[PDB]
Design a protein around this motif. Structure first.
Motif, PDB file in Angstrom:
ATOM      1  N   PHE D   6     -10.321   4.246   2.385  1.00 25.43           N
ATOM      2  CA  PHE D   6     -11.139   3.059   2.553  1.00 25.43           C
ATOM      3  C   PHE D   6     -10.259   1.823   2.653  1.00 25.43           C
ATOM      4  CE2 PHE D   6     -13.892   5.966   0.179  1.00 25.43           C
ATOM      5  CZ  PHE D   6     -14.945   6.046   1.062  1.00 25.43           C
ATOM      6  N   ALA D   7     -10.807   0.794   3.290  1.00 28.49           N
ATOM      7  CA  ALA D   7     -10.089  -0.462   3.469  1.00 28.49           C
ATOM      8  C   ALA D   7     -11.121  -1.570   3.589  1.00 28.49           C
ATOM      9  CB  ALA D   7      -9.197  -0.406   4.695  1.00 28.49           C
TER      10      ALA D   7
ATOM     11  N   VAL J   4       1.941  -4.810   4.150  1.00 25.63           N
ATOM     12  CA  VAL J   4       2.825  -5.037   3.017  1.00 25.63           C
ATOM     13  C   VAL J   4       2.275  -4.281   1.820  1.00 25.63           C
ATOM     14  CG1 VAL J   4       4.021  -6.752   1.627  1.00 25.63           C
ATOM     15  CG2 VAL J   4       3.305  -7.318   3.961  1.00 25.63           C
ATOM     16  N   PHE J   5       3.165  -3.664   1.054  1.00 22.44           N
ATOM     17  CA  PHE J   5       2.801  -2.941  -0.163  1.00 22.44           C
ATOM     18  C   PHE J   5       3.086  -3.863  -1.346  1.00 22.44           C
ATOM     19  CE2 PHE J   5       3.443   0.202   3.067  1.00 22.44           C
ATOM     20  CZ  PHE J   5       2.442   1.126   2.840  1.00 22.44           C
ATOM     21  N   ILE J  12      -0.222  -1.644  -4.043  1.00 26.00           N
ATOM     22  CA  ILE J  12      -1.376  -1.604  -3.147  1.00 26.00           C
ATOM     23  C   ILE J  12      -0.972  -2.137  -1.772  1.00 26.00           C
ATOM     24  CG2 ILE J  12      -3.756  -2.348  -2.794  1.00 26.00           C
ATOM     25  CD1 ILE J  12      -3.470  -0.501  -5.155  1.00 26.00           C
ATOM     26  N   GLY J  13      -1.319  -1.436  -0.674  1.00 27.17           N
ATOM     27  CA  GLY J  13      -1.000  -2.067   0.592  1.00 27.17           C
ATOM     28  C   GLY J  13      -2.058  -2.685   1.120  1.00 27.17           C
ATOM     29  N   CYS J  14      -1.763  -3.831   1.729  1.00 24.48           N
ATOM     30  CA  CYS J  14      -2.798  -4.680   2.304  1.00 24.48           C
ATOM     31  C   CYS J  14      -2.308  -5.317   3.597  1.00 24.48           C
ATOM     32  CB  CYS J  14      -3.224  -5.758   1.306  1.00 24.48           C
ATOM     33  SG  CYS J  14      -3.549  -5.123  -0.353  1.00 24.48           S
ATOM     34  N   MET J  15      -3.248  -5.651   4.474  1.00 27.99           N
ATOM     35  CA  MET J  15      -2.911  -6.157   5.796  1.00 27.99           C
ATOM     36  C   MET J  15      -3.023  -7.675   5.871  1.00 27.99           C
ATOM     37  SD  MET J  15      -3.850  -4.220   9.326  1.00 27.99           S
ATOM     38  CE  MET J  15      -5.197  -3.092   8.972  1.00 27.99           C
TER      39      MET J  15
END
Ligand SMILES: [Cl-]
Ligand SMILES: [Cl-]
Lengths: 16, 16, 16, 16, 16, 16, 16, 16, 16, 16, 16, 16
Positions: D6-7, J4-5, J12-15
């Motif tokens: 999920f995102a 980026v993590f 947590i990686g997020c955009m």
């Protein structure tokens, strides 16, 4: 197709 | 719980 | 040895 | 079951 | 320390 | 044995 | 939305 | 077969 | 070139 | 944007 | 250099 | 901080 990770537990990557 | 990585070699993700 | 991801399809890595 | 990714952005693995 | 993936479900990587 | 992600920083999946 | 690992072969984590 | 990570430089997993 | 996961045991990716 | 993590420790990686 | 995960959306690693 | 994959060439995740 898609790479799906079936959590049977344990997690395996099979293509569908 | 935590996703343990077992290896008996082949490695497989599994839970505890 | 290397970690090859084998394709018997399900992808499993194993240390050959 | 299968490990869904999920995102909502941050991506997190989760089950179904 | 160790990178452990807590499956709370959902799977998060936290260092311990 | 299991695949342990040590974190002594950097992270390496050494095996034990 | 979810992170889908398409396999059209090669595998890419496109987003949808 | 086996998953191969080509260094196109970007990296793509392809099944060869 | 390709990203190959060698084993020393510790598993590290290197570009060959 | 990149993936980026982030290290708030849990990764947590997020955009962004 | 470093492996950075760009986004186009599809996420691909590239060596910068 | 954030995980960074240094291209030492091998690749190592380090926390910077
Ligand atoms: Cl499909
Ligand atoms: Cl410890």
């Amino acid at each position: 197709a898609k790479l799906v990770f079936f959590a049977e537990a344990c997690i395996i990557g099979c293509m569908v």
